[PDB]
Amino acid sequence: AFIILDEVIKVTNRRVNAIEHVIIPRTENTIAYINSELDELDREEFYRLKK
Amino acid sequence: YGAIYSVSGPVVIAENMIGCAMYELVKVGHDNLVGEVIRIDGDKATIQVYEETAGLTVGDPVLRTGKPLSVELGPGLMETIYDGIQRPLKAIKEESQSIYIPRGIDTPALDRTIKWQFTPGKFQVGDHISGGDIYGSVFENSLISSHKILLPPRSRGTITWIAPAGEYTLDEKILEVEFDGKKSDFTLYHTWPVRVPRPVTEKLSADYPLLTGQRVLDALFPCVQGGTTCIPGAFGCGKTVISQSLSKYSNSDAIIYVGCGERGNEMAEVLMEFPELYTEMSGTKEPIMKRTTLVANTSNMPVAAREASIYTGITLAEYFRDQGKNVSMIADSSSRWAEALREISGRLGEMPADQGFPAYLGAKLASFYERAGKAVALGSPDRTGSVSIVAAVSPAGGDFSDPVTTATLGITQVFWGLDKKLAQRKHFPSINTSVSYSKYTNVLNKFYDSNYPEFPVLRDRMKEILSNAEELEQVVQLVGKSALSDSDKITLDVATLIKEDFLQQNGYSTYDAFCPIWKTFDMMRAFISYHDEAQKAVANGANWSKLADSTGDVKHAVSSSKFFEPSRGEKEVHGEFEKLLSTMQERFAESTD
Amino acid sequence: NTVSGVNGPLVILEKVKFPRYNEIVNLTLPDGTVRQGQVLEIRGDRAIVQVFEGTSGIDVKKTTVEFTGESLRIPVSEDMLGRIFDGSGRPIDNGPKVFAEDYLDINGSPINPYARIYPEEMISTGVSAIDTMNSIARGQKIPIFSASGLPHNEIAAQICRQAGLVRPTKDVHDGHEENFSIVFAAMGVNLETARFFKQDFEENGSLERTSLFLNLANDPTIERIITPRLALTTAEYLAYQTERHVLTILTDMSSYADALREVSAAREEVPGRRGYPGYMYTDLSTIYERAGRVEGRNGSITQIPILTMPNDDITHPIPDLTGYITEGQIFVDRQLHNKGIYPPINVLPSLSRLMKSAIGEGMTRKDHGDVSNQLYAKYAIGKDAAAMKAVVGEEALSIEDKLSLEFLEKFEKTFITQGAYEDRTVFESLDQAWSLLRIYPKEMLNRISPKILDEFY
Amino acid sequence: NTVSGVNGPLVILEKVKFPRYNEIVNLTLPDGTVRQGQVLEIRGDRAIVQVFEGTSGIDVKKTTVEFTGESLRIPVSEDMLGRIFDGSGRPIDNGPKVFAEDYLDINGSPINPYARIYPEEMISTGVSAIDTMNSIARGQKIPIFSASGLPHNEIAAQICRQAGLVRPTKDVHDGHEENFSIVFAAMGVNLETARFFKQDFEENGSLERTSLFLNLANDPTIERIITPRLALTTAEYLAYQTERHVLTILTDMSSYADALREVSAAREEVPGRRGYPGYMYTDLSTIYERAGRVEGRNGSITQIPILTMPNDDITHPIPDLTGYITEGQIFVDRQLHNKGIYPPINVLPSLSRLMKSAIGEGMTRKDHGDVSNQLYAKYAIGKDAAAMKAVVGEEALSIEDKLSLEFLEKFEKTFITQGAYEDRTVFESLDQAWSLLRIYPKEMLNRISPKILDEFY
Amino acid sequence: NTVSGVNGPLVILEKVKFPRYNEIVNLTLPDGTVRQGQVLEIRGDRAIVQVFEGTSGIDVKKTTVEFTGESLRIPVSEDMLGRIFDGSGRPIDNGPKVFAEDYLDINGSPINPYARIYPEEMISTGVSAIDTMNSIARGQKIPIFSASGLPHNEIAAQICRQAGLVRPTKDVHDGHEENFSIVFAAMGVNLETARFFKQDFEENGSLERTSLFLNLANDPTIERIITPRLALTTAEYLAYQTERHVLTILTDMSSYADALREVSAAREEVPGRRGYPGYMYTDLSTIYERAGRVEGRNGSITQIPILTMPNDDITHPIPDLTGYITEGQIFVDRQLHNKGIYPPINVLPSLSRLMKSAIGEGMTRKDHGDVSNQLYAKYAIGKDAAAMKAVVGEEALSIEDKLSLEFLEKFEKTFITQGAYEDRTVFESLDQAWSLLRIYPKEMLNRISPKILDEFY
């Protein structure tokens, strides 16, 4: 069992790093950048109607 | 009188108009087109013109009719397909050779040439009458007289003359009321303005259901008549199918089908389907179509008409509610109606503040919806009527957090979900438990307990299975599981069944979407029972693989029981399901030991 | 003179300067319909009126005007309690009106006397899950942040009805001796939803204790924004003059914010993010100025607004700004609703800003703070334990997780799950707390003083 | 009738009341050239015109105008076919006027009977991937959603090529018994690609059967929107008077949409959501108006529009508004393209709702809608099984997910991958689909009636 | 004439039509104080002015206007170093006066004579990361991209002070033969900043070396925009007339851009992407065009603008625009700063596309450019490996990856780590760089030409 545990721990240590370092900042950058562009289209329209 | 100052789109400006009301019907042009002065800024009137423009010139006379835009309510509304202000389509089809009314041509809302059979009421010479009272009837519909000839709301006086039975026309006089001298002559049809709601004596509690016939609808929360209901769509998730299927199962005495700004092939489809398709109880003669009044607008018609469509429909639903008939208002889709308000907002030259949709949108979406409900019929004779609005809603901002969807969820009480991704795998309606809620649940479930179903118990448990199953599924994806507790597998497994039997239904296979409310109770009963045995078996010891395999033969049968509908008797609780229950317990014993 | 024109619900009347700001004017149509309006703006040689009555069918040459000579004020009396009104204070109880003892300004109030002694004493609602975890003090602004996958309105009937019945249970603890009144405002309500609240208060014997204002989702926007303004004034008259605690329940804040978006572009001004006004705030603040303890220091206006987000959208201006003024919020879970736990509120993202100072004494315990800590931390570990269990199994689950697994189901089924007419003060909540906790050993309960614990485990 | 000003290509004319909506004017330039223009708006004591040939040479007092006196109408001939025509007509493209048999209004004012009559029998596009999954019926509008970074042009070309090759296969099927006509309206397309379209019609030997109207992206914006309107009017003539089945290809809807935005930057009308007109929907609907089944069942016009997604999202205005009108959609696939596949569409975002009821029998089976549904279900899972592999590994994968992975590949390179001169019968498509689908038991297949699945397994 | 009105930084004058564009006018306050402005817009019988100084206190008929009748030009002298000036065309510090021998316009073309021949002479900062990886030339434009957690002022000063000691070592080498001049302009920064800078220049050398323009944050936005223009006039004269190389340090460039943003908000001018003007491109350009070698070709203006990024994003409009225009990019990293590296310059995205113009070869090695490319390439691989070290561990990374992780660590801590006064010659840097390359084997250094690797190792 002991040899079997050693083989599994390595797959498991890899995953804990993988999520934090890659996934979480990829989600952050995508969401915020699209949020910012999306609000811009809406704001300029108001200014053009007003003008 | 007035003069056309400018023609800008389908929208017309006219100068020299004063002392006019803001819903006045106006005749624009030298062709005498229908139009409606929504607003006036000084002398200039903006008019929504409900016919095309391709040759309207300035300097042409504009004549006010001296009254609002109204609709005519009375005999011969059934079995006719109308546009959004009501013109009889059939008469046009032979005569003009057109379906979209061309300029130079106009016809009035009801027929003039058709005589009707008039039967006297309960009232006689000298009797006082007021709004929503029954002055007579005309025999229309398959199964009952549906047309009660009612005195229009807010009008009163004494009837000096009630005419005798015979056949009469609807431009012909048959009643006179005296109240301030002779009040007026009345005909069969009576007038009411569409932008103005009808009054009711009072609002009443919803407790009566409508049989939608849709197994997934009947299962997860109550089906309500008097209802307020939304179903999300997106155009390509089986939504049209479940609407026409819904029109056929509806068990209401009258159905008013409303095309907001639809496909146009579908406005053909519902027309062809109605006279040759049989209703659930089955009518006598032209089942669905006799019971149906149709307002049909395609996108291609004038946006002035598409704006009006929904109003015409609710005033018809409301008249019928006051007749003491139970009515289904089926509307598809409100977002197209909202898109129509938006088309007008840019053309008039308004200021939108809701992503290019008008600021006015929120007050109009709400005002319209509040007209549905169960209520006590307008008038003295006392009857009960209802209008249940089943409304489709859809994106329009492209988001799901766009104004259209924000306003609609707030005003509605019932939401049953639909997901596009699952719908593609073919399991529509593919209800999202999380977005779904019902307020009606408590009163409706109390009613159903009296009616015989033990429903409420199952309902919580149906929801409970689907909820835990959802959560478990993210945990299988996220960690990338190497094991599961033996109970959790059962939860997931029992949810899969729910998917097939309820959620997977096809509205053109009537073996695969039809169950009465009791049949629905029995099928769900079987599932909830399976979960109950299965949870106990693991507890007493037995492996999951043992549980699944030994249960085996009854597990196949329940899966495959979605291919049934009443056809073994006129009975709503079957031997089919009752036999399964005892066999299921027998199976449980095996699993356990 | 006559009406110059109409564009939207805006009516442009050609008049000199004769009405003062906010003066009601009566537009007299000759067709049996009299309509009232308020000048929204007065400008030179023109005034802009939005009509209370209708919105369309106005003449531009046959209308005549009369000046009422009275700017908008609310007739406030206290024989208003036990009566149903509409969005302009007219009765829908039917029968003769109640009239006034005062006409008080609705515009921001003509005297504004609100707190510079922070909230003390505890207010209970009648639900253990709200009281212990999210404690509310007299005049403290804690709203219920809700979503559209829940019936937000039901949960709202429940807090109103059960509130002020707690006050007699407190009279027995001898924490209260003063008469409690309740002010209810329903904004953008459906008929069916509206009747549901009236019938519920009627069962409890709370109807006599409350006044209800209904503005329906079919009545003008202007009428709808006025609806909370009238309600905040009634509560204030009772707090000030007669030294009463009044709890005002403002549902639905989204209806009110939406109404403001309709009047944003009605006006000649330019909105902010996502089309919602940048001066949305100014308006919201008007509600909030009336909120707090009145000078006299034994009367208050306590406020619970309900705000519904579309799908918990915090991209939307409305929860982000509203959340700043207020001191905490109560977050409701769809996940619990779906399981069939009702009420389905989750106490873990929920907050009460000042909680050791949002309670009183003699109607709370001092053990209140200690239990709020214990209850919270174990429910959170339990949420973790559910997810864990699924991966690891039960044949490899930790002994601490088992206690946390059980704790998760009992906290939900005892503290959160409770009946539609159950009532709770802090003592009752507190007894139920100790029975959940009893199962953990004393050495796992360490956020609690050894004193308290040896007495209540 | 002298010029007041010119702002943009839009021209402000002073003239006194006379012109009707969409009345043509002749612009007399001082260089001795007459150019045509349309009144977009007629007003009091001015009309505003936008000119179809350029904008050059507009002066104030050196220009004069004279009226055509006639609203815009198409000079229509049925000998128009076999020839290359243009919006205004040029002699250098060999077609300086149609030489009219009838003048019909382009707005279908004489008559326009459509959309109360239901779609008839199935028609072959020769592509298996469209025909099984989506039902293309005579007298239906089903659009092609296309995207950038992908030659959308190539897909339009494959449709043109395959049109007229299907029609003898149908004549035997009894899907056809009347003539076949292609009406090609090109607007805003690249010049190089326009020439590739012209060569495709000649090669097939289908030049005779088609009429071309070509509008460039250097030809003015009002002119650009009117060209598809001309071509649909021509389709109505053939379909109704001489009972032709018309397939009209209208490319590229993106160029139409753009035109809408640029105009109305100088009218009273003022664009909607993101600078795209709120009345963009009205424009669209005028194109969809002259499409559908025809009364009395003399012929049909069937329409296949080509839309290019410019941002590569369908949440953008051009796909979004158009999609609500349309009866389903067929959306392309970016990923297949990169691989090298042609035609590179995918089936997961592609759905036709009216599929079961529309179709005929005797060259499209009863099992057609059944099998589509099954093919999508296995594909949804296959796509997801790829995604779980990326993140975690073979950790959440299993025997079921592993099958699905195999399925996604075999389907992509066998069903979707075909030739561009391959004519595929609806009978062929179904035969191939079943062969592929053998990968799971009969008991795993329950998205199909157990009756049907035994016959055809 | 007299002030009509005032709306923000815009002033409405009711005047007469004789004024020309950017003609100075002086506003006489009732205090008898005169403040200067220039007409931004002129119309018939009226003007809009933007006043440099102030923006409030401006009256009506108690105030008066007086015309100067000279459009703004800056009084430029060559005796400007050592002399204290204020950013307003004169010292308001009471520093030594400006004098004039020419008055030169700031419009962006006075007599402007620039590069028909690109930079070829190397100018060093004494800092390896700057010089080796990107290089600096006698016309080079390099943006310092800085942050709100980096100290922007310390790096700004660092680059300038160390480039003054190196630059005479380069004069002796015959890289130069002409003077060095510094023009330092601070615009609208804090007092704390301003003081700091002056202190830094004194320590290293003197303040005789540099000329100072000081502008205070309390002074308007309109002042801030003129502040760099004043710097440009100073530098162009020195290069043109007296064949001096001029080095301009322009802090803060972001300060200037926000100012532009304010005169479109309180103007009716509609802004572009992210609320930053549409004509933002032109405003920025004006600074950057007036760079390169100056006629005679011994004079020059070389630019180092200093940008502080507020969000620290590379999607913000200011860093993006600047980058396309400028001949290089120098990115300074918060993470290096934290770790203890000074200067803490990250070269991962530092790039020059005009890399050839930037390097030298007649007073620097020819090998300089060849080594730099290899270094950058090997640094980048070393970063790809760093992310992979966190994920995968050392449990699968390759023999080649291990060399690249070592290189990365040795590279930060030796090359980029330099004393506060320690200056490195460009030749010595090569030797350091060769130490960094030396650990990799001859098969890993395969991309480089064989000739160079066998020669120098």
Curated annotation (Swiss-Prot), chain A:
Where's it found, cell-wise?
A: Vacuole membrane
Q: Which domain of life is it from?
A: Eukaryota
Additional information: Present with 8500 molecules/cell in log phase SD medium.
Which family, according to UniProt? Belongs to the V-ATPase D subunit family.
User: What does this gene product do?
Assistant: Subunit of the V1 complex of vacuolar(H+)-ATPase (V-ATPase), a multisubunit enzyme composed of a peripheral complex (V1) that hydrolyzes ATP and a membrane integral complex (V0) that translocates protons. V-ATPase is responsible for acidifying and maintaining the pH of intracellular compartments.
Q: Give the quaternary structure.
A: V-ATPase is a heteromultimeric enzyme composed of a peripheral catalytic V1 complex (components A to H) attached to an integral membrane V0 proton pore complex (components: a, c, c', c'', d, e, f and VOA1). Interacts with RAV1 and RAV2 components of the RAVE complex, which are essential for the stability and assembly of V-ATPase.
What is this protein's name? V-type proton ATPase subunit D
- Gene expressing this chain: VMA8
Q: Which residues of the full protein are shown?
A: 155 to 205 of 256
UniProtKB/Swiss-Prot annotation, chain B:
Question: How would you describe this protein's topology in the membrane?
Answer: Peripheral membrane protein
Q: Which InterPro entries match?
A: ATP-synt_VA_C (IPR055190), ATP-synth_a_Xtn (IPR031686), ATP_synth_asu-like_sf (IPR023366), ATPase_a/bsu_AS (IPR020003), ATPase_F1/V1/A1_a/bsu_N (IPR004100), ATPase_F1/V1/A1_a/bsu_N_sf (IPR036121), ATPase_F1/V1/A1_a/bsu_nucl-bd (IPR000194), ATPase_F1/V1_b/a_C (IPR024034)
Keyword Ion transport carried by entry: yes
Q: Name one GO cellular component term.
A: proton-transporting V-type ATPase complex
The Gene Ontology biological process annotation of the record reads: ATP metabolic process; endosomal lumen acidification; Golgi lumen acidification; intein-mediated protein splicing; intron homing; proton transmembrane transport; vacuolar acidification
Reaction(s) catalysed (UniProt annotation):
ATP + H2O + 4 H(+)(in) = ADP + phosphate + 5 H(+)(out)
Coiled coil location: none
Q: What does this protein do?
A: Catalytic subunit of the V1 complex of vacuolar(H+)-ATPase (V-ATPase), a multisubunit enzyme composed of a peripheral complex (V1) that hydrolyzes ATP and a membrane integral complex (V0) that translocates protons. V-ATPase is responsible for acidifying and maintaining the pH of intracellular compartments. PI-SceI is an endonuclease that can cleave at a site present in a VMA1 allele that lacks the derived endonuclease segment of the open reading frame; cleavage at this site only occurs during meiosis and initiates 'homing', a genetic event that converts a VMA1 allele lacking VDE into one that contains it.
Question: Would you tell me the protein name for this molecule?
Answer: V-type proton ATPase catalytic subunit A
Organism, by scientific name, is Saccharomyces cerevisiae (strain ATCC 204508 / S288c) (Baker's yeast)
Q: What is the lineage of its organism?
A: Eukaryota, Fungi, Dikarya, Ascomycota, Saccharomycotina
Gene assigned in the entry: VMA1
UniProtKB/Swiss-Prot annotation, chains C, D, E:
What InterPro entries does this protein map onto?
ATP-synt_VA_C, ATPase_a/bsu_AS, ATPase_F1/V1/A1_a/bsu_N, ATPase_F1/V1/A1_a/bsu_nucl-bd, ATPase_V1-cplx_bsu, P-loop_NTPase, V-ATPase_su_B/beta
Q: What does this protein do?
A: Non-catalytic subunit of the V1 complex of vacuolar(H+)-ATPase (V-ATPase), a multisubunit enzyme composed of a peripheral complex (V1) that hydrolyzes ATP and a membrane integral complex (V0) that translocates protons. V-ATPase is responsible for acidifying and maintaining the pH of intracellular compartments.
Matching CDD domains, A to Z?
Answer: ATP-synt_V_A-type_beta_C, ATP-synt_V_A-type_beta_N, V_A-ATPase_B
Misc. comment: Present with 131000 molecules/cell in log phase SD medium.
Which NCBIfam families does the entry link to? PRK04196.1, V-ATPase_V1_B
What are the GO MF terms of this UniProt record? ATP binding; proton-transporting ATPase activity, rotational mechanism
- In this chain, ATP is annotated as bound at 353
Its GO biological process annotations read: ATP metabolic process; endosomal lumen acidification; Golgi lumen acidification; intracellular calcium ion homeostasis; pexophagy; proteasome storage granule assembly; proton transmembrane transport; transmembrane transport
On subunit structure and binding partners, the annotation says: V-ATPase is a heteromultimeric enzyme composed of a peripheral catalytic V1 complex (components A to H) attached to an integral membrane V0 proton pore complex (components: a, c, c', c'', d, e, f and VOA1). Interacts with RAV1 and RAV2 components of the RAVE complex, which are essential for the stability and assembly of V-ATPase.
Q: Which UniProt keywords apply?
A: ATP-binding, Hydrogen ion transport, Ion transport, Isopeptide bond, Membrane, Nucleotide-binding, Phosphoprotein, Transport, Ubl conjugation, Vacuole
Q: Which HAMAP family match?
A: ATP_synth_B_arch
Task: List residues modified as Phosphoserine.
Answer: 109
- Superkingdom, taxonomy of origin: Eukaryota
What family, per the record?
Belongs to the ATPase alpha/beta chains family.
Originating species: Saccharomyces cerevisiae (strain ATCC 204508 / S288c) (Baker's yeast)
User: What name appears for this protein in its UniProt entry?
Assistant: V-type proton ATPase subunit B
What membrane topology does the UniProt entry give? Peripheral membrane protein
Location relative to the cell: Vacuole membrane
Phosphoprotein as a keyword of this entry, yes or no, is yes
